[PDB]
Amino acid sequence: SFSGYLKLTDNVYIKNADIVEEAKKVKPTVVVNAANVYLKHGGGVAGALNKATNNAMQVESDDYIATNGPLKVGGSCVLSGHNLAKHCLHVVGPNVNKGEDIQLLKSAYENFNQHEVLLAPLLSAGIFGADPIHSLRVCVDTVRTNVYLAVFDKNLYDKLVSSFL
Ligand SMILES: N[C@@H]1CCCc2c(O)cccc21
């Protein structure tokens, strides 16, 4: 199971880890991807997860988009987890660098409540431009299921833990 996590609340855990390496190790039922509405996994967490699947995630995603159209900001879809997990929950947090509504971050985290346990990154953090301290706060105040957060950056992980209220 998940090891080396710091417990933040009854259901939220956090670790300084590369979510790709964490997924390859744990092979959780659900790994969350920091997706965009087009499921174009170019960079950040999405680029890294997709590269770990040898682009199989992108091939599956393009078929999903061809059939269903784009996701909504704040929405999600469940696809295969490939070699990383049973499933990948592609969740679209608002991208403040694209001028999207930060208020949709709570709606994005609500998708996690449909899964009893998840390995996840902080939504809208990194290249999505939101404040990761705010993302962690929204996560702990929204998600009720068991979420294991992987924070790639050690300095950000330390800042998140040391400032956690
Ligand atoms: N590797 C096991 C397979 C069974 C499901 C599961 C999970 O939900 C979370 C963490 C690890 C695992």
The technique is X-ray
Give the integer Cα–Cα distance in Å for 32 and 34.
7
Going by alpha carbons, the residue nearest to atom 11 of ligand 1 is 28
1 lines ligand 1 (CB under 6 A): yes
Structure tokens at 72: 């909504």
Region of residue 69 (phi > 0: left; psi between -120 and 50: alpha; otherwise: beta): left
Compute φ and ψ for 155, nearest 5 degrees.
-65, -40
- Distance (angstroms) between ligand 1 centre and the Cα of 1 equals 6
- Distance (angstroms) between ligand 1 centre and the Cα of 8 equals 20
Resolution given for this structure, in angstroms: 1.0
145 lines ligand 1 (CB under 6 A): no
Sheet strands side by side (includes 87-91): 6-7, 12-16, 146-151, 117-120, 30-34, 87-91, 76-80
105 lines ligand 1 (CB under 6 A): no
Q: Which of 145, 50, 48, 142 is nearest to 93 (CA)?
A: 142
- Distance (angstroms) between ligand 1 centre and the Cα of 155 equals 28
Give the integer Cα–Cα distance in Å for 97 and 8.
28
Helix or strand run (H / E) with residue 80:
strand 76-80
Q: Which letter does DSSP use for residue 52 in this model?
A: H
Region of residue 79 (phi > 0: left; psi between -120 and 50: alpha; otherwise: beta): beta
Going by alpha carbons, the residue nearest to atom 9 of ligand 1 is 28
Beta bridge partners of 14: 6, 149
Residue located via tokens 């609340």: 9
Residue located via tokens 């990154």: 121
Structure tokens at 127: 């290249």
Going by alpha carbons, the residue nearest to atom 5 of ligand 1 is 29
Give the integer Cα–Cα distance in Å for 45 and 107.
20
Nearest ligand 1 atom, CA 116: 8
Going by alpha carbons, the residue nearest to atom 12 of ligand 1 is 28
The b-or-e profile of 63-76 (16+ CB within 10 A means b, else e) is ebbeeeeebebbbb
Going by alpha carbons, the residue nearest to atom 8 of ligand 1 is 29
- Distance (angstroms) between ligand 1 centre and the Cα of 28 equals 4
**Cβ-based burial of 43 (10 A; exposed 0-12, middle 13-18, buried ≥19):** middle
Residue located via tokens 């902080």: 122
